[PDB]
Fold this protein.
Amino acid sequence: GIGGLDKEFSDIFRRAFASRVFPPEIVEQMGCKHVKGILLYGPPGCGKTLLARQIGKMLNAREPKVVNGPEILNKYVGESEANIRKLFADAEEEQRRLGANSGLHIIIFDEIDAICKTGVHDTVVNQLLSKIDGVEQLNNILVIGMTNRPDLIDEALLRPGRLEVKMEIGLPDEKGRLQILHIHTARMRGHQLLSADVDIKELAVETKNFSGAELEGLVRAAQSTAMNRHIKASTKVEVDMEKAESLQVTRGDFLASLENDIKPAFGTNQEDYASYIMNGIIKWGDPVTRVLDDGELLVQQTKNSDRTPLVSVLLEGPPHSGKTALAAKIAEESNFPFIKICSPDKMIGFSETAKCQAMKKIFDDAYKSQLSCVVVDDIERLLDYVPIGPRFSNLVLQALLVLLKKAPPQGRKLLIIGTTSRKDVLQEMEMLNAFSTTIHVPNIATGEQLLEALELLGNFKDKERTTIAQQVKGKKVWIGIKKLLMLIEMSLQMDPEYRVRKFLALLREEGASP
Amino acid sequence: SIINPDWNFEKMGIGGLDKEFSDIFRRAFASRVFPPEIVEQMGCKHVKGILLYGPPGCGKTLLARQIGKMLNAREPKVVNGPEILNKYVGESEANIRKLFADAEEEQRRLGANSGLHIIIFDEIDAICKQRGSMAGSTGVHDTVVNQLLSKIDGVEQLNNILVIGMTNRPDLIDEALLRPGRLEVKMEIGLPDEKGRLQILHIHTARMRGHQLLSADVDIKELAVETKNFSGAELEGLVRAAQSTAMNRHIKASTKVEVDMEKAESLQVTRGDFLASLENDIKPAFGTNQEDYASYIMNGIIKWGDPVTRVLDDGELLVQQTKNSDRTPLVSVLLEGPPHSGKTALAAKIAEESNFPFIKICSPDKMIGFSETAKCQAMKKIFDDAYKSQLSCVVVDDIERLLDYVPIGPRFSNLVLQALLVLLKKAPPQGRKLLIIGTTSRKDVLQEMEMLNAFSTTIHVPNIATGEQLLEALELLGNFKDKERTTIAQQVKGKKVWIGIKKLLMLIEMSLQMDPEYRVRKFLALLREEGASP
Amino acid sequence: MAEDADMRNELEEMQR
Ligand SMILES: Nc1ncnc2c1ncn2[C@@H]1O[C@H](COP(=O)(O)OP(=O)(O)OP(=O)(O)O)[C@@H](O)[C@H]1O
Ligand SMILES: Nc1ncnc2c1ncn2[C@@H]1O[C@H](COP(=O)(O)OP(=O)(O)OP(=O)(O)O)[C@@H](O)[C@H]1O
Ligand SMILES: Nc1ncnc2c1ncn2[C@@H]1O[C@H](COP(=O)(O)OP(=O)(O)OP(=O)(O)O)[C@@H](O)[C@H]1O
């Protein structure tokens, strides 16, 4: 009754139960051993317990023994360790009586971390370790444990012959959550106390990383939002009693509650991808089209080449030319399963080692997919550089030079896009030879392009545009788009009479030639 | 009924906690009030827990006791701190179960239609802490926590109990207990606002007005305006201190204590007592967030020339632009000029003139002996705090002193420079606006480092240049008489001068130490010898 | 590595 773990079940069968089929005689002459320790870890869910019951079903095993939490702990002395030996009494009896031809024994531990990790705890751990593997050896006992914090388990329990199989279990997902939601909502649906405007699929999609107590918690909250409309407190505890004849639950009563009342415990998938594109992309010339076409050509090569699984590019241009946005646009249009952006904004005050670790982790994550794309921006800021001296960090430079020519595992593709605004420095440092190719991002050169950009922005009307064209059309200009937006915003502040003059005044100071 | 017939919101004397009480009533008491038929139809379960927390002296105990008084039921049981621990083994659980035995018995005897029982736990963190993260000297605490968890929600179901717990450090509490079914509703009490500060002051003054013991000159609104960041306890303490000051004026102690008793029957409280107390007795426990603008502006500002007005107008224009823009959420500006020109005072004035909710100034005066990492951490903390508010303004002064610059070699700290260069281009979260004002005295050095391009605009702050401006400044300060002014003019008017205002003040103060027949001369020399400059 | 310092102890009484 679980999907997405078919290969995991196949591995489980291969590891342990694949060797159980042969009669005892053939294994005896072989002397081959058998598995008796399995550990499962993964966030909370019904899958692990369902799996345990499934293993209980398939084999001709006794009624499995399951312990629910730290019930072993006791106030008296010697009782905490006393509960353990009772567990294996039947196993010892069967082993001593029927010998090899004895039934299998299955033990299920729930929240084993609670008991295994001071006189009570250490003695309990020692008793359990001795019973599982002591002077007497048992070949008909299986122990299964489930955890959500694997790092809190004792190391000794992981030594070979104590816990043999390691298993990772995924979380429950949308359709199961929908089944649980339907089961809970059935009561209100039956009595027509639920508004027809509510869509369960929408809420199931919206609620992500929530458990059952939280999933009940969201619904209960919604209910409250309804009842409070009938109450008439704040002066007394007397209520309407006439609106009590009817009561329903609207869609909003749910939505509000998931924003302002109930919060997920495991966080949420936060993304601010727009952060890198705050004003869209406006075609004011041919260079944008040329850059996009080159990006598409590079993308197709990575995806179809057999001899070159790794490809690198570099974006060049003067400051305030809009390179970080034109790289993100290409990355978005790539349409690859894995996309990530490495920026110095997230690393402030870090030392060289921290930066190296941060880059290494992102690349390690990238390697595990089939085809991936990664973009690094502000290289000069990443390896802090200052014209005086000059001074910089050599560790990060060497890490980058090593990473730029390391192929991923066999059969996988990777693309890397780097952005900078100081080409000469990189050329001097001998890094410009690592990249496979380069592209150039120019500024606005002629007045016609500036007029087209203004028209697309739509900030000035025809009357002012006429004067602007008269002044600028007969001359060359040198300005970046970001600076242009800043200047327009700055000039717009004053009264309508002075705006054109202020804008033209500023343009002359910011004017220049390459 | 379950509610006392005479109960009403106004009688409990609570302050400005309207929203919190309404939320409690909604989420905790809605179910018990509706008729049994409909609630049974829904078949929903009832809340059983509440966890109040916040800074000290906000009203948690007051709120809990008022809730206890409001409800008509058995007398609430109170567990006064860690009174449940005992040296003998197994007796702590005895008490922790004796508390709930009566409720269990009543629920067994009457069933679903039984009354309600309320239990109040004070200083819960003392008893309940994480079982794993605890002292190993004794397992008594773990057994206590397990007993409480089992009793509150065990195999047997109990549904006629409400438990109230108050603390100050919610982090220490175990996670297993703060889950739905035990304590799901968790409030946070905080400092009040101006309206809350007015309501609180009203609640206490009532009787004095009733008996005509308060002078008419007292304005409660003004008091609420001044008292910023105060809490209810501090407000009551201020009232008590003013009362004591008023009362002290009818006793002649210090040899033997006596009371008038005939001139002491006409007592009244004036506004002077409140003003005196507000500066001597009560200081806010939470450090005042308002900057100490007096320290930075120690001698005011005097309009000795047009440039002052020009700079102020430019600052106002920048403030307006950052306030009324959406395409450019972040703006920056740099003030530059020769030393001893008064850049810091002008920047502080520009910051003050704006009415932004959040204003802070970062200076190296506090970072003495700090490493190159502590400075980065402090700047990061300041900017993180600034990010929260919708509108923010920040001032960074003495940049060259913040980078540890020395012209020999030269030397400086790279990490701080990189952090600043990154923070000058990081836009704040969506829908927020930030302004940054920087001050420096060496523009060429910043140009060399290639950070002058990171700012958006620059403003120049000049120093006195012409003799007329000097005469105007002297007139404004008024430190010399007409005869001396004529004598000084006869010389200065001929040529030009080059001096900063701060140095002018220092020179005047040094000159005024001589005898009257020499002071003027002492002044001129000091201007001539030091005045050699462009 | 500096070895952990010394620690105090807490005692529990039993009645016969
Ligand atoms: N056609 C365009 N190409 C690029 N950017 C554009 C275009 N049209 C509008 N923009 C906007 O211009 C801004 C480009 O600024 P961006 O930060 O990408 O530039 P940059 O060259 O990396 O800057 P810097 O050198 O200051 O780091 C973004 O707001 C982008 O939305
Ligand atoms: N909101 C308020 N309205 C009226 N009086 C208040 C208010 N807050 C505090 N006070 C006054 O201050 C006293 C202190 O409040 P209280 O004892 O409830 O604080 P507390 O938060 O429980 O304390 P602590 O956290 O220090 O243990 C109250 O008894 C009352 O005198
Ligand atoms: N019109 C004025 N403008 C500026 N400051 C003034 C003016 N009139 C008086 N002052 C006072 O002059 C004093 C000098 O200002 P301040 O100490 O900020 O100068 P500064 O240029 O930042 O100094 P430094 O060169 O030492 O860094 C301040 O106390 C300020 O109050």
Summary: Residues 93 and 144 of chain B are 6 Å apart (CA to CA). The beta strands of chain B are 49-53, 77-79, 117-122, 161-167, 330-336, 358-362, 391-396, 433-440, 457-460. The longest helix of chain B spans residues 91-110. The longest strand of chain B covers residues 433-440.
